[PDB]
Amino acid sequence: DGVYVLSVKEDVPAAGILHAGDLITEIDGQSFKSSQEFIDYIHSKKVGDTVKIKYKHGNKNEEASIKLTAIDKKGTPGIGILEHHHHHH
């Protein structure tokens, strides 16, 4: 159904937009069955980009635009959250 937010770094755009315990359901108007997609989509975008995230805070239908970044060191494109899911399973 969607990626569950587990943590949010201090040095990222969504540092205050997305709070722990949210459920990112839409990604640029794109819904995904598995968690992988979310991983791919981002993994395709470029750093500093601005994607549209539609999350759920408890039960409220929110949404916002986040500016990607290198959640690692290889400059990979990411949002900077930790998911509850494990591996690419």
Phi, then psi, of 19 in degrees rounded to 5: -100, 155
| Total domain count, the chain | 1
| Cα–Cα dist 38/46, whole Å | 14
Tokens, residue 28? 């640029």
Q: How far is CA 22 from the centre of its chain?
A: 10
- Domain of 75, CATH number, reads 2.30.42.10
Cα dihedral across residues 23, 28, 33, 36: positive or negative: negative
Query: Which structural domain, as residue segments, surrounds residue 60?
Result: 1-89
Resolution (A): 2.9
| Cα–Cα dist 53/79, whole Å | 10
DSSP conformation letters of 31-80: E-SSHHHHHHHHHHSPTT-EEEEE-EETTEE--EEEE-EESSSS--EE--
Distances (CA, A) of 28 to 8, 62, 87: 20, 13, 23
Q: Which of 12, 20, 16 minimizes the C-alpha distance to 84?
A: 20
| Cα–Cα dist 46/42, whole Å | 8
